[PDB]
Each structure stands twice: as C-alpha cells, then as structure tokens.
Amino acid sequence: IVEGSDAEIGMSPWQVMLFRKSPQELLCGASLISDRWVLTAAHCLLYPPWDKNFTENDLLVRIGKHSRTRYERNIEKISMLEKIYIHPRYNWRENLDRDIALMKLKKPVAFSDYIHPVCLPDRETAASLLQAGYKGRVTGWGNLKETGQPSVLQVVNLPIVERPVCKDSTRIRITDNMFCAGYKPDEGKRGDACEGDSGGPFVMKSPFNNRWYQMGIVSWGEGCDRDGKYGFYTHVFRLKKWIQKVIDQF
C-alpha cells in the first residue's frame, strides 16, 4: 500500500496472509469469507512466466494478524491448506483475466475479536456500490513504495474509476472481470496498492445494512501510485457464480 496509513486493531478482521512454507515468505494477501474458505488472487498461486505453480503443500495462511513481524499471543492463528482452486479460465498469458483463487483450510478457524469473515456481494449490493466515484478500501502488507515493508497492516480509501478512464490508462486489454480504482492527477490525493498486496480485499461498507462487502481482489498495476495510472482489481461479483459453485461442490 502506497500513501496509506496504519490500520486500527480489528479494522479488517478478514485479512489473511499467504505464505510460502519453504522457505517461509509472505507472498500475498487474502480474505476470510467463512470459517474454512479464503479468497485470494490466482497469480499469487500460479504464474508460469515467473516459475510459480504452488499447490496445497507449498503454502500456509495466517489469520488475525496486525503487525507483519511480531507474534501476537492468543490472537493470530495459523492454518494449512486442504485444497486450492484456480478459476479454469484464468488468463496469465494475456492480462490476468479472472485473477481469482479459492483456498479451503485444513481446519476451520475460530472467530474472535480479530478473526471474522467479510460478506460477498449479492446482485443488488454490487449494482448499488460498484459505481464510479464511490470509494472502497484496500488493505495489505505489501510494499510502501515502488521498488519498504510496513510493520503493521496498511489501509487506504480509493474511488472507483469510470471504465473509459481505466481503458485509456493502459494498453493492456482490460476485461469486464476487472475494475480499476485510484485518484486522478487532478484530485490532489494519492494512494494505491503495490507489489505484494495481490489477493488483498477491496471492500465497501454498505449504507443499507452497515455490513462490509468485498467487491474486489488486488490484482495488478503498472508501477504504484503513478499519476494517470490506476490499480486493477478482480471483479468479485462477476465471478461469484464460480465461487458458490466451488464451495457447494466441495
């Protein structure tokens, strides 16, 4: 997160860290959607051009954390992965279209003041909230600047951007499975996701029922917080069908 600030404790209880097991390293962010299911970005798990093809045994997750480094006794929980599910139409050769992935935990985690799932949006909620100019919130332990690592989880509020501005901001072919967000150069504020924040949630608090909904997954960008560029997020609702299918099948 570039140009963000420190999250308060318990501000984002669905935040999950995704580690490679051996050697242990923070690879990505992710979110908790139930006691046993975790959402993340597909390229965090599979990205051949960079020699990435992780399976269940290569990864672990940590839930309920605030500080990147220091251990938080009786707060944070660790879990292994029972199953990994990539979207079958994930396009890593072109533009990261459908950059989404589901991970089923070996053992359900217990909720607490620090561990609590985020809502997935229904149709009405998505139609109401994914509107240009409307602001969502992005969280992660990723880089603070374009290539540096925060001590505590970072948070930033960013407006959704009109689809034509998104199209004209990049020569990469964008799809309806993507949305972009960030401030325009004119608006005089800054903020962006950055390398390492992939898989983190783009959330919005619904004025109708005061529940937080995950509309997006940090997916990709060209640089971080560059003027005229925007960060791009996997459109969660557009793939919700797939999510439900997977969860109901397994």
Partner: peptide
C-alpha cells in the same frame, strides 16, 4: 452468515477512523 460486521467496531457501536470517507463518497 454473520459477515461484514466487525467485533471491535460495528458490534461495539464504534466508527473506524475513516469509514465516513466511504459513506460520504456514496452520494
């Protein structure tokens, strides 16, 4: 489920430092 409602904020009738920015954007 019980989703999207935070123990330390919504369940304690307490506003997070910046969520009002989101609400006020929703106009």
């Amino acid at each position: 489920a019980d989703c999207g409602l935070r123990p330390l904020f919504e369940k304690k009738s307490l506003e997070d430092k910046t969520e009002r920015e989101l609400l006020e954007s929703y106009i």
